[PDB]
Amino acid sequence: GVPTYGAIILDETLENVLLVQGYLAKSGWGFPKGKVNKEEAPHDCAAREVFEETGFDIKDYICKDDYIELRINDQLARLYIIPGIPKDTKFNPKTRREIRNIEWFSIEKLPCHRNDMTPKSKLGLAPNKFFMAIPFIRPLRDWLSRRFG
């Protein structure tokens, strides 16, 4: 798998995160991110994907050491952490064939796992519209705890 790069944007209170909603296979909510182009540096990919999906430019705010990275089915996803972006910021995707909507969510209200179906004696997990975001939530809470307290 080709690696993906993007950002976790937080507001000034550190309470809220910016998610984007896609279409079809990507119909639910996730952090803004996408696949790296040939010979493109990780920080340049993250700024390009975030600007395409939100219309906000992170280039002057990226810190090279501040990121969460996960490997999911042998594909690497690295999201740079960008705190302190005001909630009254005007966001507008470029790529509206790809992005349905953009919204702020409370970090403490987001799920960090999907629910089983043990009440139905059935295997697997119940659908959840935050499925693409969920793997990063626990690592994000732990990162904010260590850096800020």
From Swiss-Prot:
Role according to the record: Decapping metalloenzyme that catalyzes the cleavage of the cap structure on mRNAs. Removes the 7-methyl guanine cap structure from mRNA molecules, yielding a 5'-phosphorylated mRNA fragment and 7m-GDP. Necessary for the degradation of mRNAs, both in normal mRNA turnover and in nonsense-mediated mRNA decay. Plays a role in replication-dependent histone mRNA degradation. Has higher activity towards mRNAs that lack a poly(A) tail. Has no activity towards a cap structure lacking an RNA moiety.
Localization in the cell: Cytoplasm, P-body; Nucleus
Subunit record text: Found in a mRNA decay complex with LSM1, LSM3, LSM4, EXOSC2, EXOSC4, EXOSC10, PARN, XRN1, CNOT6, UPF1, UPF2 and UPF3B. Forms a complex with DCP1A, EDC3, DDX6 and EDC4/HEDLS, within this complex directly interacts with EDC4/HEDLS. Interacts with DPC1B. Interacts (via N-terminus and C-terminus) with TRIM21 (via N-terminus and C-terminus). Associates with polysomes. Interacts with LIMD1, WTIP and AJUBA. Interacts with DDX17 in an RNA-dependent manner. Interacts with ZC3HAV1. Interacts with APOBEC3G in an RNA-dependent manner. Interacts with ZFP36L1 (via N-terminus). Interacts with NBDY.
Portion of the parent chain present: 96 to 244 of 420
PTM annotation: Phosphorylated at ser-249 in a MTOR-dependent manner.
Organism (species): Homo sapiens
Annotated Nudix hydrolase domain residues: 1-131
Annotated family: Belongs to the Nudix hydrolase family. DCP2 subfamily.
Binding of Mn(2+), residues: E49, E53
Nudix box (motif): residue ranges: 34-55
Encoding gene (name): DCP2
Tissue expression from the record: Expressed in brain and testis. Not detected in heart (at protein level).
Name recorded for this polypeptide: m7GpppN-mRNA hydrolase
